[PDB]
């Protein structure tokens, strides 16, 4: 038996589907696939799939992710076979993956009997409009949005029957999730008769089906969307959420239907898509830095690099300077944004007191100050981001809404904009113009971190953990430096007090500043010109060279670092000065409304603590040191003092200099 790879080039059967299942070639495919995933070497010289299997064993999950381009660069014929005949290849590849997993963990079958594989990124991408007859029974990659999700129900996987006319027990049968098992002659007795399921000896799966429309960002303008049906098997249940744009790699298949034939009067068949991989594509449209189902996941070596680079001196400065590397100046805005997207620690006292652990930021200033670019970068880098703007958002659109389901005909809850911002940031542009009724509906979202609805006989409370970043413009289009903040905007104290860090940006006239800004802008414009081994990695090193000149660290490493710090590190607060902070709060209560107009309350003390915890988080440290508290108090004092009239700004600056000596 010549089980050589080159013998697979030429087919002897009429089609691939009847050739792959041949016993002679199937074992060759299995052994070659084993030699592939046991020996594939990455750029560093180590088997990446080994680390993948170790991590899978740690997390005891169900899905092992195999990269498509890895299987394409080496052993392209197997990739072609997978692309043309997915159903017949995934079974063999699951078998070999199970063998590989049991190689590292003997007796792992007790944890789970079968393993499912996932394909990372197929080369060709289609749309819902571009679907034809040719691409049937083959892998497809479809981008869309989720509209209606049915739910979770079990299914039979290994079906057996007991025929009582002859006492015959049928063997284990499989189900294709869309076809009913139909047996004609009922095994050896060769006769049809009554039978029963006898489900005491059976195994179960769970499924979920969903409706997929077209993304409004890719539909032709003024046209209508197209709908398809997507079926999710085990380990893919509840991964997708309503209203979330997704990209699904799956298999295209067709089945008969009666009413569909009746209405059209022609032999037309229905089509469904069974999912094989899902990738969320909400907000973060930047999808060129790295490949994979998720870009916020880290390997063990990346964790090691995080720990190695999280201990160097002055990492806070590098993190701040590496954010928005194409915007000149505005150091305070960068620091505030970093402290807002790193967050704090929520506090629960005896399960009976609640302290919010997220920081809000309000921006304000003159036009032409690139606030919207900062907001766009924040949306790009955050894991969960939602963009609202001006009057285009309503009060019930941000919060939860109640809707009557057209099918079952009863009221149900519809997830609002803020619900999608859980463990994330919600970004608002043109905050000032938004109508007051559209603005007063986020007070609980800012402070109470919970949404309560009592409408149409439904009384429920919805949790919301979101950070709000807003941008606005002052009255008259410019900030009058010789007037207090109370006469610059129409917002009141109840909304102003809920913002921790408030930044005021002024556009002045300076010669050397203008020359420097012009030089930086011109060099940025020249830098981003579209015209200046494997060519792809040469393009990658060119991108890295172009990137290293404005940012101390690469962007994808920064995103994974932010995710890791938000997930695992929880700072603790023990050895801090009681009296310094208490006296500073007393001093801020002094002056303020007693001399000016800006409101200061107990919320700002908790804001100082949260900023200190955020600064502790940035270093991947479990305990808050004194330097972090000094930085936080300096930031808060500067932000307070830099929002007064020009008559008292110098006086307050020299009055508050005793707390931030350093």
């Amino acid at each position: 038996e010549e089980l050589t790879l080159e013998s697979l080039s030429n087919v002897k059967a009429n089609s691939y589907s009847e050739w792959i299942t041949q016993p002679n070639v199937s074992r060759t495919i299995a052994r070659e696939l084993k030699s592939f995933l046991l020996e594939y070497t990455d750029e560093t010289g180590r088997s990446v799939y080994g680390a993948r299997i170790r991590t899978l064993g740690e997390m005891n999950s169900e899905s092992l992710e195999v990269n498509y381009r890895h299987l394409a660069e080496s052993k392209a014929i197997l990739a072609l076979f997978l692309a043309k005949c997915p159903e017949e290849m995934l079974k063999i590849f699951d078998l070999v993956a199970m063998e590989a997993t049991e190689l590292h963990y003997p007796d792992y079958a007790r944890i789970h009997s079968e393993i499912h594989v996932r394909i990372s990124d197929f080369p060709t991408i289609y749309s819902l409009r571009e679907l034809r007859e040719s691409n049937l029974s083959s892998l497809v990659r479809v981008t869309g949005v989720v509209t209606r999700r049915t739910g979770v129900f079990p299914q039979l996987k290994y079906v057996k029957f007991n025929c009582l006319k002859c006492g015959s027990i049928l063997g284990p049968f499989f189900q294709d999730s869309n076809e009913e098992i139909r047996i004609s002659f009922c095994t050896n007795c060769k006769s049809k008769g009554p039978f029963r399921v006898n489900g005491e000896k059976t195994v179960y799966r769970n499924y979920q089906r969903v409706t997929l429309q077209e993304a409004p960002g890719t539909v032709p303008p003024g046209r209508l969307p197209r709908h398809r049906e997507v079926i999710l098997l085990a380990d893919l249940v509840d991964v997708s959420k309503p209203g979330e744009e997704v990209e699904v790699t799956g298999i295209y298949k067709n089945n008969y239907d009666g009413n569909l034939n009746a209405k059209n009067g022609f032999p037309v068949f229905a089509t469904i898509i069974e999912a094989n991989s899902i990738k969320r594509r909400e907000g973060n449209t930047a999808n060129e830095g790295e490949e994979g189902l998720d870009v916020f996941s880290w390997t063990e070596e990346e964790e090691r690099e995080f720990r190695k680079i999280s201990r160097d001196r002055g990492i806070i400065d590098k993190i701040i300077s590496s954010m928005a590397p194409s915007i000149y100046g505005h150091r305070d805005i960068k620091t505030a944004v970093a402290c807002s997207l790193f967050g704090g620690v929520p506090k629960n006292v005896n399960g009976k007191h609640s302290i919010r652990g997220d920081i809000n930021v309000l921006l304000l200033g003159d036009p032409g100050t690139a606030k919207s670019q900062i907001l766009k970068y924040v949306e790009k880098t955050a894991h969960r981001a939602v963009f609202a703007t001006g009057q285009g958002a309503s009060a019930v659109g941000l919060t939860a809404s109640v809707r009557k389901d057209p099918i079952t005909k009863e009221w149900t809850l519809e997830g609002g904009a803020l619900v999608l911002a859980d463990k994330g940031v919600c970004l608002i542009d043109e905050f000032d113009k938004m109508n007051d009724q559209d603005r007063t509906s986020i007070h609980e979202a800012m402070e109470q971190q919970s949404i309560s609805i009592s409408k149409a006989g439904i009384v429920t409370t919805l949790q919301a953990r979101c950070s709000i970043i807003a941008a606005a413009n002052p009255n008259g289009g410019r900030y009058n430096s010789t007037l207090p903040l109370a006469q610059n905007v129409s917002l009141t104290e109840p909304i102003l007090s809920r913002f921790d860090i408030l930044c005021v940006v002024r556009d002045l006239v300076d010669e050397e500043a203008d020359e420097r800004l012009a030089t930086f802008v011109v060099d940025s414009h020249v830098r981003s010109h579209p015209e200046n081994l494997n060519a792809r990695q040469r393009r990658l090193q060119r991108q890295r060279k172009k990137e290293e000149e404005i940012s101390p660290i690469p962007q994808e490493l920064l995103m994974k670092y932010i995710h890791y710090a938000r997930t695992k590190i929880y700072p603790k607060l023990h050895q801090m000065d009681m009296d310094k902070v208490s006296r500073v709060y007393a001093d801020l209560r002094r002056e303020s409304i007693s001399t000016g107009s800006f409101p200061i309350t107990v919320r700002h003390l908790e804001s100082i603590l949260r900023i200190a915890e955020s600064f502790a988080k940035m270093r991947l440290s479990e305990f808050v040191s004194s330097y972090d508290l000094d930085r936080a108090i300096k930031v808060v004092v500067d932000s307070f003092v830099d929002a007064q009239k020009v008559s008292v700004r110098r006086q307050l600056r020299r009055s508050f200099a005793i707390y931030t000596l350093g």
Partner: protein, 302 residues
């Protein structure tokens, strides 16, 4: 039986998590320890959700084959010294109790239950706790033992939470003769006014220190704070050999010279201490008097 913390009354995951020997051998105070523990569990084959259930409802087949699972899996991680032989007592349909679990329950019930005037009040509280522990001995009472078991769990949690912070902060100063660490500030420091609780913490710390690559056997000094009295409670601790050592290097157990050092310093210098505990290596010293004293102990022949 095994060197495990309340195996028959807590989940197997917590039993591995809180065990002092396992902690020392696998460094569970950082994340690599938890990763190694998860590798251990996955290779043994017990599901993470199954291992986090009560021992009563834990799967019967795995409870039966646990011995073989441990025998085949512990060798790679090097925990083959955890298996030993112990005594188990059963009375009717009540259940099963082991000697180690019973003594831990008794110790914790002694620890927790229910200037000079406050010291006398503390001492009478301690004698009342002793009487309650004595009453708990008889077989007719079991609500005085379930409470002790749950208090043991709580106290071990608190000790672990304080020790991880100490090891993070690196408060263990390495002097030329003896190591030193002082719990100047932190949470729940009022619990450590009990000498037996302080000895428990010191035992865990000395086990962690011994289970390292350092080749120095030095006595350890541990101190705490009682802000009401403004006094330090200082206890001297002896070094200990690794539990997995032969008898040839056990010619004589390690002695304790801290009592002699303290008595000599107090007899040659008018320090404001109060040496009255039956344990001669535990003293109460003043906050302002701790340091000079310390240098004296550094300069005196130990």
């Amino acid at each position: 039986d095994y060197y495990l913390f309340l195996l028959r009354h807590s989940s197997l995951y917590d039993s591995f998590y809180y065990s002092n020997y396992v902690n020392a051998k696998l460094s569970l105070w950082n994340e690599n320890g938890k990763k190694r523990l998860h590798k251990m569990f996955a290779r043994m084959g017990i599901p993470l959700s199954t291992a986090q259930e009560t021992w009563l409802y834990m799967d019967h087949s795995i409870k039966r084959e646990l011995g073989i699972i441990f025998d085949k899996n512990l060798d790679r991680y090097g925990l083959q010294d955890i298996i030993r032989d112990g005594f188990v007592r059963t009375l009717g349909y009540r259940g099963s109790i082991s000697a180690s679990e019973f003594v831990e329950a008794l110790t914790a019930l002694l620890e927790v239950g229910n200037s000079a005037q406050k010291l006398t009040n503390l001492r009478k509280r301690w004698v009342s706790n002793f009487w309650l522990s004595w009453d708990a001995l008889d077989d007719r009472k079991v609500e005085l033992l379930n409470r002790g078991i749950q208090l043991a769990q709580d106290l071990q949690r608190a000790i672990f939470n304080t020790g991880v912070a100490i090891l993070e902060k690196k408060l263990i100063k390495h002097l030329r003769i003896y190591r030193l660490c002082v719990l100047q500030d932190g949470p729940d420091l009022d619990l450590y006014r009990n000498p037996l609780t302080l000895l428990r913490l010191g035992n865990w710390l000395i086990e962690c220190c011994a289970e390292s690559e350092d080749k120095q056997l030095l006595p350890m000094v541990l101190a705490s704070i009682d802000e009401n009295t403004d006094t330090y409670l200082v206890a001297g601790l002896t070094p200990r050999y690794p539990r997995g050592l032969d008898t040839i290097h056990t010619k004589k157990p390690i002695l304790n010279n801290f009592s002699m050092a303290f008595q000599q310093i107090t007899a040659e210098t008018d320090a404001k201490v109060r040496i009255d505990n039956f344990e001669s290596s535990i003293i109460e010293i003043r906050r302002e008097d701790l340091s000079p004293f310390l240098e004296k102990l550094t300069l005196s022949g130990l």
